[PDB]
Amino acid sequence: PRSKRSKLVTLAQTDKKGRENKERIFDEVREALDTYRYVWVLHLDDVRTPVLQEIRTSWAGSKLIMGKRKVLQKALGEKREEEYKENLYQLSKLCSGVTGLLFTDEDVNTVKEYFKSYVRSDYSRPNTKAPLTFTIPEGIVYSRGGQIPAEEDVPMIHSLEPTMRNKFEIPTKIKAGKITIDSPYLVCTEGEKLDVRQALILKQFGIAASEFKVKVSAYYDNDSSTVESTNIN
């Protein structure tokens, strides 16, 4: 019973959900299929909850169901035999990653134009090159780190120097409470496939200079019971 790793227990309020949540999502999607006319698939791989809430508040009449890929695959039907309605696994197979499956009764073209005109700012999200280039100045670094006049900003907090020095691999010293470096550290170049620590550096300095525009792949109509594929971003 021994020579194991002890699980670090902590005492919080929230608790795991289990199979009841998944069955609830299953029943919800299956009862909304009968209700609404059109159903769409939206690939939302890395999002902010306020952006998702904006997308949801854009229509209180239409539904948006997130959840687990394999659960929505089962609700729709992955096999041509196992399916709720006809030609539905043809849609269910399109789901790739984080899929937000939307239901509506609204016209095709309103949705199509909305989800290509909708664009927001977001972080650069590693494994994705960034359209920016940053040499930090070679003096004292500020909370924005080379984005505005330093006379606006204040120096960052001394508590971040272990983080910058170890996790971000920046060469860092501090003279009094201020953080300092000797030479201008370049972090990234445009058209350079980003890595985790570059992304974290840009996040720490507060750089949302990437275009979040949701991708839509397919679309299915209940009365026609047909699929239709439109890669629109």
Binding site: S3, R165, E169, P171, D182, S183
Partner: protein, 187 residues
Amino acid sequence: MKYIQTEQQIEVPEGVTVSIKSRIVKVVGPRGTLTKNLKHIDVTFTKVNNQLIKVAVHNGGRKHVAALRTVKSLVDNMITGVTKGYKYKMRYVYAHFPINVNIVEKDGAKFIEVRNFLGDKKIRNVPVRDGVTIEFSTNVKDEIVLSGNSVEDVSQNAADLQQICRVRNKDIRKFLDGIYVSHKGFI
């Protein structure tokens, strides 16, 4: 429970050549060669096809299985060191007394010489190990880089450096002078 047979796989890239009689292991690649004795271990080796070498243990327990996994890890480290290499960057810091770090060749032995640590006249000498190369990093204040293929020798020399300059009978909350490992990685 006396597992009837347990196995681990070792991947060999194209430039690397691995030679294994009884439990001696020779690994040759671009950056050089490496040798290691594993006769203490009592496992079995075998080859599949020029890129995959398997190590096996028959009728053994928990400690034997652990020895299998760490053998795999050691051979993988050898391959990584002969292909890419190991590079450890250390930085030496001071508040008042500038620590002077130099190299000396004494009887052809390559000692590292540290002077004036916290204001002492003692001269701290650290022998450099074979397969380790010291250079003083340019355009970076008070940094020294140890490069080689033996991660063991490189890390142990860095440890010797950061241990020889330990502070004695002083609050380390106040006295920050020392030599510390800044970065580990490849070449």
